[PDB]
A paper describes a structure:
Crystals of E256Q/N258G and E256Q/N258P were prepared by co-crystallization in the presence of 5 mM G3 and G4, respectively, and the structures of E256Q/N258G and E256Q/N258P were solved at 1.7 Å and 1.5 Å resolutions, respectively. Structural analysis of E256Q/N258G and E256Q/N258P in complex with G3 revealed that the conformation of the maltose moiety bound at subsites +1 and +2 of the double-mutant enzymes was different from that of E256Q. Torsion angles of d-glucosyl residues in subsites +1 and +2 of E256Q/N258G and E256Q/N258P were close to the torsion angles of d-glucosyl residues in the stable α-glucan: Φ (5-O, 1-C, 4′-O, 4′C) = 102° and Ψ (1-C, 4′O, 4′-C, 5′-C) = –120°, which is considered the global minimum energy structure. A molecular mechanics study of maltose suggested that torsion angles of d-glucosyl residues at subsite +1 and +2 in the E256Q-G3 complex are less stable than the global minimum, and the conformation of G3 observed in E256Q/N258G and E256Q/N258P is predicted to be more thermodynamically stable than that in E256Q. This conformational difference of G3 presumably arises from the elimination of steric hindrance by Asn258. In the E256Q/N258G-G3 complex, an additional hydrogen bond between Met229 and 3-O of the d-glucose residue at subsite +2 is predicted. This hydrogen bond may stabilize the Michaelis complex and stabilize the transition state because the Km of N258G was 25-fold lower for G3 when compared with that of the wild type. The side chain of Phe282 of E256Q/N258G and E256Q was suitably positioned to interact with the d-glucosyl residue at subsite +2, whereas that of Phe282 in E256Q/N258P was distal from the corresponding d-glucosyl residue and unlikely to have any contact with the substrate. In addition, the carbonyl oxygen of Phe282 was suitably positioned to form a water-mediated hydrogen bond with the d-glucose residue at subsite +2 in E256Q/N258G and E256Q but not in E256Q/N258P.
Bacillus sp. AHU2216 α-glucosidase (BspAG13_31A), belonging to the glycoside hydrolase family 13 subfamily 31, specifically cleaves α-(1→4)-glucosidic linkages and shows high disaccharide specificity. BspAG13_31A has three domains common to GH13 enzymes: domain A, a catalytic domain that adopts a (β/α)8-barrel fold; domain B, a long loop connecting the third β-strand and third α-helix of domain A (β→α loop 3); domain C, a domain formed by two antiparallel β-sheets that follows domain A. The maltose moiety of G3 and maltotetraose (G4), covering subsites +1 and +2 of this enzyme, adopts a less stable conformation than the global minimum energy conformation, presumably because of steric hindrance by Asn258 at subsite +2. We solved the crystal structures of inactive double mutants, E256Q/N258G and E256Q/N258P, in which the general acid/base catalyst Glu256 was substituted with Gln together with the mutation at Asn258, in complex with G3.
Residue numbers in the entry: 3 to 289, 294 to 517, 521 to 555
Write the structure that this text describes.
């Protein structure tokens, strides 16, 4: 019923995808050079992370010119070539729309900060201090205060994210008008839509009241002051009417603070802000084995919850903000098996699946010895803030190694040449040493590779409508090792069975005129009875019943 429901999306982090000119930084001509790879994978939609002019304090999410390409990545002519090549391959491109905040080097902010009476002052969020300190006790998501003092005008500006990412004032009609014009300027070029960044953060609680601080911390996590706050829907409804609704595009909103039963306004077919949202509930399961049943509960709540409102799920396990999914949800002791198990698990639920670069190879976390090898502004600021407070170097590195999103930002691993073929120079972030084992070139020619498993997943989803539009139903809910579910559409039922445990397990097949195995990550045992499945660690199978 919709092209974006049937699509499989691939997410490119361009700084780490392909360097075409030896400076160690991925670029647009690098992306163009690998479009055959994404075509051959079977990708329908490419989401490219921000490629706009940026000082790169937050690697593109701090934008200083919305209408110019980041110099590191190329020019508008390179972008025009990329879009032309993508569209001639029958693929689509969505851009990363970043309008909660700008760079502090954006011309609007350079005007805004210059004087209280500057006409751009109210484009951002300014407030006098309180009792000689910040206007309130809110913490930035990147640690430290959510307020930065301006010596010249003697006021603080708010930044939910880095000090170089001042938040835009969405209560200002002039701001909204300029943002809508710029969105439509991009849409007029014929891009196919947007992933909408941090979009849950655009409504701040008026008066910015202090939050509880019983532990007398320096600052306190401030989501209750700015994540999905009452009043946000007025802005998002206007954004949709003034921009997205005028074009045949897809939108996926990155929307924290939305629950599976309160998602109508965000994604309902009748009146939702977006076609689909990224929600974070399944990415917050920290400890000793993974709580499989809590994962079932979360994902099933979203399957059932959006089915009731005619919404649509964005399916994912990886992106540029998370650690690698083999680490987070699988096992490094069963890297290939668990990568495939996880793939079948998340990809075949009802929704639009996203593949993050390297996920299709089973890429895993890195451990660099030195803080100087890392880049993430959030984790570097965390280091500095916590080191100042007396946290030891080793305690801080443990947090960065186990939770830091730099784990997903190491160069894409193309082959076993220098830098895994990502660059002829010195990569901006070092390649994971396991590229000698994990790389596209080796996986292409190995029928058993993670890459070719993803290829077959994409193919079976395209060829069987039940895997796109079939109703989801959780099976065997209480089983602490097996995640199993069905997809049903008329006379076809797909059964997805995943042994999400590092042990052998036995599972009773749910009890058709015909049965077919669509995909499997272990050799099939001829003597095995369908009724009593003897599953190996992280074994997955997908059956098709008529
Ligand atoms: O452009 C700044 C930043 O924005 C994007 O990521 C941010 C999310 O928008 C924001 O909601 C927050 O995510 C947190 C979730 O709300 C919370 O449920 C849980 O998942 O912890 C997260 C805290 O970090 O913060 C992220 C960034 O950390 C964008 O995708 C980022 O790349 C970008 O840096
Ligand atoms: Ca380059
Ligand atoms: Ca067996």
């Amino acid at each position: 019923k919709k092209w974006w429901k049937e699509a499989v999306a691939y997410q490119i982090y361009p700084r780490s995808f392909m360097d075409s000119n030896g400076d160690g930084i991925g670029d647009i001509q690098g992306v163009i050079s690998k479009l055959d790879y994404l075509s051959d994978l079977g990708i329908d939609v490419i989401w490219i992370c921000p490629i706009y002019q940026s000082p790169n304090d937050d690697n593109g999410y701090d934008i200083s010119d919305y209408k110019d390409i980041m110099k590191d990545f190329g020019t508008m002519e390179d972008f025009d070539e990329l879009l032309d090549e993508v569209h001639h391959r029958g693929m689509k491109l969505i851009m990363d729309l970043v309008i909660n905040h700008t760079s502090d080097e954006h011309p609007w902010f350079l005007e805004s900060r210059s004087a209280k009476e500057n006409p751009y002052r109210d484009y951002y969020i300014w407030h006098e201090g309180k009792d000689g300190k910040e206007p309130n006790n809110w913490e930035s998501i990147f640690s430290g205060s959510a307020w930065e003092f301006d010596e010249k005008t003697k006021e603080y500006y708010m930044h939910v994210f880095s000090k170089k990412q001042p938040d835009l004032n969405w209560e200002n009609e002039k701001v909204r008008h300029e943002l809508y014009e710029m969105v439509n300027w991009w849409l007029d070029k014929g891009i196919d839509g947007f992933r909408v960044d941090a979009i849950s953060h655009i409504k701040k609680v008026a008066g910015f009241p202090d939050l509880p601080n019983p532990e007398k911390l320096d600052y306190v996590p401030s989501f209750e002051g700015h994540m999905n706050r009452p009043g946000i829907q007025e802005h998002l409804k206007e954004l949709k009417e003034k921009t997205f609704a005028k074009y045949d595009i897809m939108t996926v909103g990155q929307a924290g603070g939305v629950t599976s039963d309160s998602a109508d306004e965000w994604v309902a077919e009748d009146g939702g802000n977006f076609n689909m949202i990224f929600q974070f509930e399944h990415m917050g399961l920290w400890d000793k084995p993974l709580d499989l049943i809590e994962l079932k509960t979360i994902l099933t709540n979203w399957q059932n919850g959006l089915e009731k409102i005619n919404g649509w799920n964005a399916l994912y396990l990886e992106n540029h903000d998370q650690i690698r999914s083999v680490n987070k949800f699988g096992s490094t002791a069963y890297r290939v098996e668990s990568a495939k198990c996880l793939a079948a698990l998340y990809f075949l639920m009802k929704g639009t699946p996203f593949i993050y670069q390297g996920q299709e190879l089973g890429m895993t976390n890195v451990k660099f010895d030195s803080i100087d090898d890392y880049d993430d502004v959030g984790m570097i600021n965390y280091y500095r803030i916590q080191r100042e407070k007396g946290d030891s170097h080793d305690e801080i590195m443990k947090v960065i190694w186990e939770t830091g999103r730099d784990n997903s930002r190491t160069p894409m691993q193309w082959n076993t040449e220098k830098n895994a073929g990502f660059s002829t120079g010195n990569p901006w972030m070092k390649v994971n040493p396991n590229y000698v084992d994990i790389n596209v070139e080796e996986q292409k020619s190995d029928k058993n590779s993670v890459l070719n498993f993803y290829k077959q997943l994409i193919k079976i989803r395209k060829q069987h409508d039940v895997l796109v539009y079939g109703t989801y139903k959780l099976l065997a809910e209480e089983d602490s090792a097996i995640y199993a579910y069905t997809r049903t559409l008329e006379g076809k039922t797909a059964v997805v069975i995943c042994n999400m445990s590092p042990n052998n397990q036995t599972f009773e097949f749910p009890s058709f005129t015909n049965i077919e195995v669509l995909i499997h990550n272990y050799p099939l045992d001829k003597n095995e009875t369908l009724e009593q499945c003897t599953l190996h660690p992280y074994e997955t199978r997908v059956y098709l019943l008529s």
